[PDB]
Design a protein around this ligand. Structure first.
Ligand code: CLA
Ligand code: CLA
Ligand code: CLA
Ligand code: CLA
Ligand code: CLA
Ligand code: CLA
Ligand code: CLA
Ligand SMILES: CCCCCCCCCCCCCCCC(=O)OC[C@H](CO[C@@H]1O[C@H](CS(=O)(=O)O)[C@@H](O)[C@H](O)[C@H]1O)OC(=O)CCCCCCCCCCCCCCC
Ligand SMILES: CCCCCCCCCCCCCCCC(=O)OC[C@H](COP(=O)(O)OC[C@@H](O)CO)OC(=O)CCCCCCCCCCCCCCC
Ligand SMILES: CC1=C(/C=C/C(C)=C\C=C\C(C)=C\C=C\C=C(C)\C=C\C=C(C)\C=C\C2=C(C)CCCC2(C)C)C(C)(C)CCC1
Ligand SMILES: CC1=C(C/C=C(\C)CCC[C@H](C)CCC[C@H](C)CCCC(C)C)C(=O)c2ccccc2C1=O
Lengths: 143, 731, 74, 74, 94, 165, 31, 74
């Protein structure tokens, strides 16, 4: 079994001068994501919102408007720095949902113990014709 | 949040795309949530009632505005020297010179001069007074209210008809041909004979006295004894004057053909005879199919029997009855194709065979009517092909259409598309090459080096009609021939007088420029058909996207993978073909307008030696006839043509605003909107208010549609302004 | 190569010396065409007893400013 | 421009933006032209004439055609 | 926030970390003087309801139509003034 | 007179157009000296114009209302009235030459398709092979008809890709 | 002979009646 | 395009022209000041009035410009 890591709120943030591409009004009333990673030295990386930031030694904490920004930062950390990280979904009511490394290992590597949903056992051309599903509220591929 | 109640998927969208797609998917009832086929067809039937009520209200409004603010009384007495008045103008933006410049046809204040031809039509059908027009408007108001009540009534479950009633094809065709087509035509014959024929001869016939006036002095007895020739005794003479009893007659069903010498229009007795024959034939046609009386046809079995042996058509028409009957999109495509072709026929016939009294003297009315019906026909034909593509996407079943002609034509669709491509490529190559060669030899000072291919085939068919101008002496152009001798006491004298006269539009004399522009029209039709047919046949799938039928009729793309998949849906093919339709109808109406501008000035030469090269088209037509248009307002003042100058620049603006959505695509705009959302979300004194719906860029399909709509609106407004200004300001 | 071509056309196929005598009335021209398909009509009556395309590039004014006043120097 | 179009088309030339109605004068540009025209003998003591005739002064005519004349802004 | 150093996230204080701030809004009871506040709340008393503030727009549209009825002509306006002869046209028309 | 058209040998407007062109060129002449290079160029242009008009009158072209030659694009209507050179003979000529070019390109495609690298042979053209096939394409109609009768010109539909309908 | 005031007013009232019919049909179609 | 349109109209209307020892006769005659504030003025007094030279250029030395005027539209 695998347990998700807790979001340690009192985690230091990278050195940054302040951008205009950061959080907006969506964070207060819908959602804002957050990414946490461990860096082995003080070095400069690129923000998903524009500009350069310096992440510090040890834990680094960065909140972002969208999950795609968090994954862009994570993939640039993994490629240009060989640094893994954790992404969390933080609701404004207080509940925090763990996100990307959901079962510990990365999704491109098998784990034996995942849900194989949305996997049809037919070919592309074996879907139903749209006339046979007429007036149903579903596309032919989700039958 | 719950505005698109027909689509809960759209209602959950927290952006402006929710309302944008809620407006545009309102009439796609088949895609609505919880929609059965019974409720579908009942909604269709009630919306049909609403549309009929709308049409009847629109024509009642035309009648009321002509009766209330028009000059119908003054136009009846002097049809050739009175400008018809559409409606009065009440615009508080007018300055004093605008108020003077728009006071024209003897009215008290500013009015619009009608170009719709309602004056000529109403004068021809026997309407003489404003009281009659008001009575017609009131009657149409009442009947539109009745149709609205019927639309409400049939939505009530006690009066909702069954789905099988909607699909009862044999009965619906029987009643439409016999009653909707035949009985209506017979009643129009009754109106023409009872009212229009005496009102054409100065004898007033109304509801107060039509039961005491005799349409023919030998009443009904020649009809019932079979002596029907007594209804064609003395026709109206060549010296007859419309609306007067001078040299009139008693015959109600003449057959002379040609045109009335004074009105330059068809004989009304010819129309009554035509409508009576049409009524008889359509009632007979409506007695064809089987209903409940044990006689008639089962059209399914007729389709079953239409299978030639040796497998020439595969299974023939196996199961096409159910294919047409089950698919509303197949029926709509057939109906739109036929209605668009009929609209083209109406345009091609009313200019050359003017039906209404004192038509073809009003040059603006003829041109406006022709161009209107041509554009309507082109739009409706594009809709027919689009709905055929929808039927392939939605209602096409390969199992029940296995081996029949639909499956056959889908099997070798590559041959059809490739041969349409070859024909369009040939036409474009050759017509453009001839035009550019003519331009170059004109520029170099050598007009004698032009390639001027004589349209010998169309001239030969003109000679087969009796046009003795090319010296063929073929069929009707030789009096000794059997067709010429067969009807020489029938339609031949009037038709020959019309065909041999250069004062009308009955088959105009044609030359090499007509040949070149006809090949231009052929190229336009071929390429538009290529785009539409390719979109229909590739709607279910292609090599780039085999599973296109699962994605629906309209969708943006398939992403930048596989080299790029921009504009891959059948909706996008319709979208591309609308431009080609607009270009083709532009060529058609440019040809018509320039030819008739040469005719009406008496200078057929300007078109004859200026249409063979494109600089003549640009200079002697576009540049020359726009001089009075662009001087509608100027620093020296303004006149009545100012409204068409403003509409000219308006259409140019809308056309380029269309180009805005056409060229730029969704991505620059989304970033810009995000930046402006950042600006507003943290601008002081404006953070008090916030958007209920998140501002987003228009979707790819939506903005394609918006750019196409602006393109078409600017196209139509610009050409309507130019045509009406260049004809009304000159004649 | 482009500059050499412009100077060669000013030397050989131009009315530069004639234009120098009467710059007010003679239209500058530095390109002539071969009479092949009726295109010799493009050779304008620019003046100076010369026929050619009227140029709008201003090489004649530049050469006069530099003080050429000779065909051999171009 | 659209307001000017609408007022001309409505027969209201007094309501459009023009020199004869609602004026919109380039006062900064006109004053800059005046400063350039008055520059010689004042802020350009060694200049015998202005840099260009576009600022102001007499019309320069060569061979019966205007070489350069003052440009007025409205 | 708990931003005593570089910690800009806190689940126990999630209000400040998200970015919800007043920017310039400040709480203060003192602003408008006496009697005039009562004067203005009496001026806008029953009108505060949505139906009556709709009825104000209704009487505004009634004024819009009253301009057209009697008000456009009171400021002259060319659309209701008289006319001065007419023009014939290109050919013999009217 | 095949369609209400008059021959340009006897049509007055053809002579009027020729006279107008020659008069315009003479107006251009009346500005230079007699032996200048522009004078020789204008004299050559005049000679070309008169030769062209006389040739058009000689060849038997049809002129319409004014003096512009018109071409007939109907076999039979042009054959029995002697205007097959208007459209029919150039139709045969284009069909022959276009078939020559297309057959040469086709045979190059089928010759390089059965090589080691057909991809390289279409950007790097084997010039001797292209020259040989261009020469062989002059007998394109007989070769094409022979390959059509043999059945080797067209491909069976079962070996050609289509979309899944 | 142009139509009178009473004819225009009666026509406008009948148009109001058919507008009531129209909104009834529209409400029935929405349901 | 707008910049060069303004340039050509402004100097054909207020700069370029002929002198007659009593005034300056401009190419278009001072029409910029009363027509360049209106889009219909740009379309008519500049874009239609000055276009008559390129469309009636067939049969002359400017026939190449006339041909290119249509080819560029194409
Ligand atoms: C004899 C009986 C009869 C009659 C008179 C009608 C009549 C009509 N039906 Mg109906 N129907 C019938 C029986 C009948 N039906 C039966 C038995 C069934 C059950 C099987 C149905 C089922 C049915 C359905 C489901 C629907 C209709 C609809 C309609 C309307 C068609 C739309 C329209 O008005 O366009 C008018 C058509 C014409 C005028 C024909 C003109 C021909 C061409 C197009 C024009 C050329 C004419 C001429 C040149 C134009 C000149 C005029 C110009 C001067 C202005 C129409 C009034 C539709 C509707 O609108 O719903 C209310 C529809 O949805 N019917
Ligand atoms: C549907 C159109 C229509 C209508 C409503 C009328 C109505 C009328 N006509 Mg008329 N008529 C018509 C068409 C029509 N006609 C046509 C097409 C022609 C030939 C061009 C004539 C020629 C004509 C003449 C010469 C005369 C009339 C006369 C009359 C009036 C006396 C009634 C009558 O004729 O005696 C009664 C008729 C019958 C007993 C026979 C009718 C039975 C028929 C053969 C079968 C019914 C089937 C038919 C399709 C039903 C249609 C229903 C439709 C009304 C909805 C009457 C108001 C007479 C008159 O005095 O004028 C005031 C007169 O002299 N008509
Ligand atoms: C009898 C005629 C008829 C009928 C009943 C239908 C019915 C239908 N069509 Mg169709 N169509 C028609 C003709 C018709 N069409 C014609 C003539 C064309 C060619 C223009 C098309 C092209 C077409 C396309 C491409 C599509 C449909 C679709 C549909 C379906 C949904 C309609 C919709 O999208 O919601 C409502 C439609 C609208 C609200 C139209 C939008 C408004 C237009 C574009 C703007 C008009 C602006 C106006 C002119 C501005 C005035 C100018 C002035 C200010 C200067 C529906 C079943 C869609 C579909 O099947 O879904 C998959 C589809 O995508 N139609
Ligand atoms: C003539 C067609 C046309 C028009 C009107 C516009 C208009 C506009 N473009 Mg655009 N564009 C066009 C063609 C056009 N473009 C084409 C063909 C392309 C493809 C290359 C582009 C590509 C493009 C880009 C990439 C961008 C724009 C941008 C803009 C906006 C700039 C803001 C502005 O000008 O302020 C004012 C608005 C106007 C002058 C438009 C006319 C408004 C009139 C004059 C006044 C409004 C009164 C109104 C009519 C009254 C309401 C009546 C009521 C009944 C509705 C503007 C609305 C830029 C933008 O997003 O904003 C900065 C942007 O970046 N365009
Ligand atoms: C920007 C460079 C440029 C351009 C655009 C031109 C353009 C032109 N030149 Mg020119 N030329 C140039 C540079 C250029 N030249 C230079 C640098 C020289 C000095 C060596 C010349 C010397 C030259 C001569 C002597 C002539 C031209 C001529 C011409 C005209 C006809 C060309 C032609 O069809 O020949 C033929 C096209 C071929 C494909 C054959 C090329 C074979 C040559 C001999 C091989 C040279 C390598 C043409 C408008 C002719 C002319 O003005 O007509 C009266 C002419 O006689 N040029
Ligand atoms: C491309 C299609 C085409 C078209 C539209 C025409 C049209 C025409 N041809 Mg023609 N023809 C064609 C192809 C075509 N041809 C071809 C390919 C050949 C070569 C075999 C001929 C050989 C030919 C001859 C020999 C004659 C015509 C003639 C005619 C004219 C009279 C035909 C007639 O009497 O009535 C229609 C005939 C039917 C059988 C129907 C007519 C305008 C005749 C003519 O010259 O007119 C005076 C004539 O004698 N044609
Ligand atoms: C010699 C090669 C060749 C051959 C034999 C063909 C043959 C054909 N083409 Mg095709 N085509 C070619 C090259 C060729 N094409 C090229 C290079 C292009 C890209 C521009 C196209 C683009 C094209 C399109 C878009 C279409 C065709 C179509 C067709 C068919 C209709 C007849 C036609 O001439 O259409 C016209 C052909 C053209 C407009 C292209 C001609 C280009 C040149 C002249 C050919 C190449 C010459 C070649 C380099 C010579 C090599 C010599 C060799 C010794 C090395 C036909 C079977 C049509 C079709 O599908 O019909 C059903 C069609 O829609 N072609
Ligand atoms: C054509 C359609 C015309 C429709 C007109 C509707 C108008 C709205 C309406 O009736 O509201 C009904 C309410 C009554 O509410 C009710 O008024 C009741 C009192 S009584 O019932 O009116 O006596 C009260 O008890 C209750 O609380 C209150 O809700 O009336 C008002 O309160 C309106 C008062 C508006 C006062 C200010 C007007 C504008 C000031 C201009 C300042 C500058 C002047 C220069
Ligand atoms: C086919 C039979 C047609 C012959 C009709 C003869 C008519 C008069 C004879 C006549 O008109 O003159 C000869 C005529 C063409 O000659 P022309 O009239 O053009 O000669 C005059 C000019 O060419 C010289 O200035 O030849 C033909 O008839 C058609 C040529 C056969 C087509 C060859 C194609 C073979 C495939
Ligand atoms: C897409 C699609 C569709 C649609 C299609 C279309 C659109 C079609 C069309 C088309 C058309 C639009 C057509 C037209 C037509 C017509 C015709 C085809 C005709 C004919 C005939 C004849 C043969 C004639 C003859 C004659 C003449 C010539 C004249 C005089 C008289 C006579 C008789 C002699 C559908 C839905 C279906 C299906 C699906 C897909
Ligand atoms: C301008 C633009 C936008 C921006 C979208 C805008 C500016 C839409 C905002 C328009 C406002 C709402 C004014 C529209 C005025 C209309 C006349 C109102 C019509 C409303 C109907 C209900 C009648 C895109 O999103 C886009 C996407 C893809 C290709 C091209 C483009 C594009 O050109």
């Amino acid at each position: 079994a695998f347990t998700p890591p807790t979001l340690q709120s009192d985690t230091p943030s990278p050195i940054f001068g302040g951008s205009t591409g950061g959080l907006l009004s969506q964070a207060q009333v819908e959602e804002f994501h957050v990414i946490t990673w461990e860096s082995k030295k003080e070095q400069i990386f690129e923000m998903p919102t524009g500009g350069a930031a310096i992440m510090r030694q040890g834990p680094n904490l960065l909140k972002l408007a969208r999950k795609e920004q968090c994954l862009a930062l994570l993939t640039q950390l993994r490629t240009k720095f060989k640094i893994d990280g954790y992404i969390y979904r933080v609701f404004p009511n207080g509940e925090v949902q763990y996100l990307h490394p959901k079962d510990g290992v990365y999704p491109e590597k098998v784990n034996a113990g995942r849900s194989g949903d949305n996997t049809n056992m037919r070919r592309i051309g074996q879907n139903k014709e749209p006339v046979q599903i007429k007036f149903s509220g579903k596309i032919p591929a989700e039958f | 949040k719950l505005f698109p109640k027909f689509s809960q998927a759209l209602a959950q969208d927290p952006t402006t795309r929710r309302i944008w797609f809620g407006i545009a998917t309102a009439h796609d009832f088949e895609s609505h949530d919880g929609m059965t086929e019974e409720r579908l067809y009942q909604k269709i039937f009630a919306s049909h009632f609403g549309q009929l009520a709308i049409i009847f209200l629109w024509t009642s409004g035309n009648l009321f505005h002509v009766a209330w603010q028009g000059n119908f009384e003054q136009w009846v007495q002097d049809p050739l020297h009175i400008r018809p008045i559409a409606h009065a103008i009440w615009d508080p933006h007018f300055g004093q010179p605008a108020v003077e410049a728009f006071t024209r046809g003897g009215a008290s204040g500013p009015v619009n001069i009608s170009t719709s031809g309602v004056y000529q039509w109403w004068y021809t059908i026997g309407l003489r007074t404003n009281q009659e027009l008001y009575t017609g408007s009131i009657f149409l108001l009442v009947l539109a209210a009745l149709f609205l009540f019927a639309g409400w009534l049939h939505l009530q479950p006690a009066f909702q008809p069954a789905l099988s009633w909607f699909k009862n094809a044999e009965s619906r065709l029987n009643h439409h041909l016999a009653g909707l087509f035949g009985v209506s035509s017979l009643a129009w014959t009754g109106h023409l004979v009872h009212v229009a024929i005496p009102e054409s001869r100065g004898q007033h016939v109304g509801w107060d006295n039509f039961l005491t006036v005799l349409p023919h002095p030998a009443g009904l007895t020649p009809f019932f004894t079979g002596n029907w020739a007594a209804y064609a005794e003395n026709p109206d003479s060549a010296s007859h004057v419309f609306n007067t009893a001078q040299g009139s007659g008693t015959a109600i069903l003449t057959f002379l053909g040609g045109f009335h010498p004074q009105t330059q229009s068809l004989w009304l007795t010819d129309m009554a005879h035509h409508h009576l024959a049409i009524a008889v034939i359509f009632i007979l046609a409506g007695h064809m199919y089987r209903t409940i009386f044990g006689i008639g046809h089962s059209m399914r079995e007729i389709l079953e029997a239409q299978t030639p042996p040796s497998g020439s058509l595969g299974a023939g028409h196996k199961g096409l009855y159910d294919t047409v009957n089950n698919s509303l999109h197949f029926q709509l495509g057939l109906a739109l194709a036929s209605v668009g072709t009929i609209s083209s026929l109406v345009a091609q016939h009313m200019y050359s065979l003017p039906p209404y009294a004192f038509l073809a003297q009003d040059f603006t009315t003829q041109a406006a009517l022709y161009t209107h019906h041509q554009y309507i026909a082109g739009f409706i034909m594009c809709g027919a092909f689009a709905h055929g593509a929808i039927f392939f996407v939605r209602d096409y079943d390969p199992a029940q259409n296995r081996g029949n002609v639909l499956a056959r034509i889908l099997d070798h669709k590559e041959a059809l598309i490739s041969h349409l491509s070859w024909a369009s490529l040939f036409l474009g190559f050759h017509t453009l090459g001839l035009y550019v060669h003519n331009d170059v030899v004109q520029a170099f000072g050598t007009p004698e080096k032009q390639i001027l291919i004589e349209p010998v085939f169309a001239q030969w068919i003109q000679a087969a009609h009796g046009k003795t101008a090319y010296g063929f002496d073929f069929l009707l152009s030789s009096a000794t021939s059997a067709p010429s001798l067969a009807g020489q006491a029938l339609w031949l004298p009037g038709w020959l007088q019309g065909i041999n006269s250069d004062a009308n539009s009955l088959f105009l004399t044609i030359g090499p420029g007509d040949f070149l522009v006809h090949h231009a029209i052929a190229l336009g039709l071929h390429t538009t058909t290529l785009i539409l047919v390719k979109g229909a046949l590739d709607a279910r799938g292609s090599k780039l996207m085999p599973d296109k039928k699962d994605f629906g009729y309209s969708f943006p793309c398939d992403g930048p993978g596989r080299g790029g998949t921009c504009d891959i849906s059948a909706w996008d093919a319709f979208y591309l073909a609308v431009f080609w339709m607009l270009n083709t109808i532009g060529w058609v109406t440019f040809y018509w307008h320039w030819k008739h501008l040469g005719i009406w000035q008496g200078n057929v030469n300007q078109f004859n030696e200026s249409s063979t090269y494109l600089m003549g088209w640009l200079r002697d037509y576009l540049w020359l006839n726009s001089s009075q248009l662009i001087n509608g307002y100027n620093p020296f003042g303004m006149n009545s043509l100012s409204v068409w100058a403003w509409m000219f620049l308006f259409g140019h603006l809308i056309y380029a605003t269309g180009f805005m959505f056409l060229i730029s695509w969704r991505g620059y705009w989304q970033e810009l909107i995000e930046t402006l959302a950042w600006a507003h979300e943290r601008t002081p004194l404006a953070n008090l208010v916030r958007w209920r719906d998140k501002p987003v860029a228009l979707s790819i399909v939506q903005a394609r549609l918006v750019g196409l709509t602006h393109f078409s609106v600017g196209y139509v407004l610009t050409y309507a302004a130019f045509l009406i200004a260049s004809t009304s300001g000159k004649f | 190569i482009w500059l050499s071509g412009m100077y060669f056309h000013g030397a050989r196929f131009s009315n530069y010396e004639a234009w120098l005598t009467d710059p007010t009335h003679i239209k500058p021209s530095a390109q002539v065409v071969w009479p092949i398909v009726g295109q010799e009509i493009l050779n304008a009556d620019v003046g100076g007893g010369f026929q050619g395309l009227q140029i709008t590039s201003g090489f004649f004014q530049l050469w006069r400013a530099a003080g050429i006043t000779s065909e051999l120097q171009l | 421009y659209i307001h000017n179009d609408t007022m001309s088309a409505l027969g209201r030339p007094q309501d459009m933006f023009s020199d004869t109605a609602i004026q919109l004068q380039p006062v900064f540009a006109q004053w800059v032209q005046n400063t350039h025209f008055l520059a010689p003998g004042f802020t350009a003591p060694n200049a015998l004439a202005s840099t260009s005739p576009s600022w102001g002064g007499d019309v320069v005519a060569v061979g019966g055609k205007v070489a350069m004349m003052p440009i007025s802004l409205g | 926030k708990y931003g005593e150093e570089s910690r800009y996230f806190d689940l126990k204080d999630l209000e400040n970390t998200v970015g919800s701030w007043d920017m310039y809004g400040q709480e203060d009871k003192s602003r408008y003087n006496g009697l005039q506040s009562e004067f203005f709340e009496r001026a806008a008393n029953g009108l505060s309801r949505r139906e009556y503030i709709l009825g104000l727009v209704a009487i505004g549209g009634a004024g819009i139509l009253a301009w057209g009825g009697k008000g456009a002509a009171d400021v002259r306006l060319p659309t209701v003034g008289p006319q001065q002869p007419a023009q014939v046209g290109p050919r013999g028309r009217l | 007179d095949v369609a209400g058209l008059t021959p340009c040998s006897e049509s007055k407007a053809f002579a009027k157009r020729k006279k107008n062109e020659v008069k315009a060129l003479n107006k251009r002449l009346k500005n230079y000296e007699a032996d200048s290079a522009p004078a020789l160029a204008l004299k050559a242009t005049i000679a070309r114009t008169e030769a062209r008009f006389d040739k058009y009158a000689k060849q038997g072209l049809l002129c319409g209302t004014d003096g512009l030659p018109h071409l007939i694009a109907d076999p039979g209507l042009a054959l029995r009235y002697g205007h097959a050179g208007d459209v029919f003979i150039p139709t045969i000529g284009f069909i022959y030459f276009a078939g020559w070019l297309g057959y040469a390109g086709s045979k190059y495609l089928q010759a390089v398709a059965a090589t080691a690298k057909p991809i390289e042979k279409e950007i790097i053209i084997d010039v001797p092979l292209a020259w040989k096939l261009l020469w062989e394409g002059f007998g394109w109609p007989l070769r094409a008809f022979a390959e059509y009768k043999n059945g080797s010109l067209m491909e069976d539909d079962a070996k050609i890709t289509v979309s899944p309908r | 002979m142009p139509i009178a005031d009473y004819q225009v007013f009666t026509a406008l009232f009948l148009a109001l009646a058919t507008g009531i019919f129209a909104v009834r049909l529209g409400v029935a179609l929405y349901k | 395009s707008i910049v060069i349109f303004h340039f050509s109209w402004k100097m054909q209307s207020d700069v370029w022209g002929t002198v007659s020892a009593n005034g300056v006769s401009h190419i278009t005659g001072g029409n910029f000041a009363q027509s360049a504030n209106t889009i219909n003025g740009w379309l008519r007094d500049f874009l239609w009035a000055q276009s008559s030279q390129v469309i009636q250029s067939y049969g002359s030395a400017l026939s190449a410009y006339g041909l290119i005027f249509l080819g560029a539209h194409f």
